[PDB]
Amino acid sequence: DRDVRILYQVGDSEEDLPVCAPNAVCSKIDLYETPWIERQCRCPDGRTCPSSLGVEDGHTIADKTRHYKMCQPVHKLPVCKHFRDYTWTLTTAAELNVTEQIVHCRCPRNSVTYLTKREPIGNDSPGYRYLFACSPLTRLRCQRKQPCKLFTVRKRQEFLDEVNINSLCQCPKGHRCPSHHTQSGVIAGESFLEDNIQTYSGYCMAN
């Protein structure tokens, strides 16, 4: 069986986690390489955060290489309108080293989420709330010699990375865009922010 690691957004055990707010993502599952789970919060009211790696439990929202697990079934959430609706928001409590992701709607199929706006959290709390919207997948065709996908790879442990992918364009027919930063057609970019965050660019390769 694969080494599916269980990590915690804060501390190292269930007991160290906050209780989930309504509609908070309770776990994030990363499916870029070997699946792993990062626990965010503990579900209230006797429920338990779902831990399966697929979407067939009915508590899952998929986006790019991640699955977001919710305490309650996702069919209860409305479908977002592209651009206008915020699928989710992010806030951080800096003193608690805790992030909260509140989900408002599900993006349509063939969508990508993106950071779109910010607003103050409110009168009594410090900082900003970040608002994410849904955009349709790009129909863009790659220019010759331009990258088709960007990777940002954070080495969390020596054998566990947290990775964000950004697709840029569709390769010509008969060509493939690399889907992992170790495939052929990938060039290392630069360190970014920290020594353990590395960017890569993938290019269209014949076949």
């Binding site: 957004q9 651009f83 790009t138 331009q146 947290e162 964000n164 630069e190 965050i197």
Partner: protein
């Protein structure tokens, strides 16, 4: 607390002369494109 994007992001990510930038939310940068007036979407690819 916003950051300048890495070179390849700066060069290729944001379309239609939008501005690339990163926000550090939870140890990972989140990239975003600040759209020039008249555009919308993840990479500011769409006209409003």
């Amino acid at each position: 607390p916003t950051y300048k994007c890495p070179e390849t992001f700066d060069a290729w990510y944001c379309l239609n002369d939008a501005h690339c930038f990163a926000v550090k939310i939870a140890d990972l940068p989140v990239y975003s494109c600040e759209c020039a007036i008249g555009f919308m979407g993840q990479r500011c690819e769409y006209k409003e």
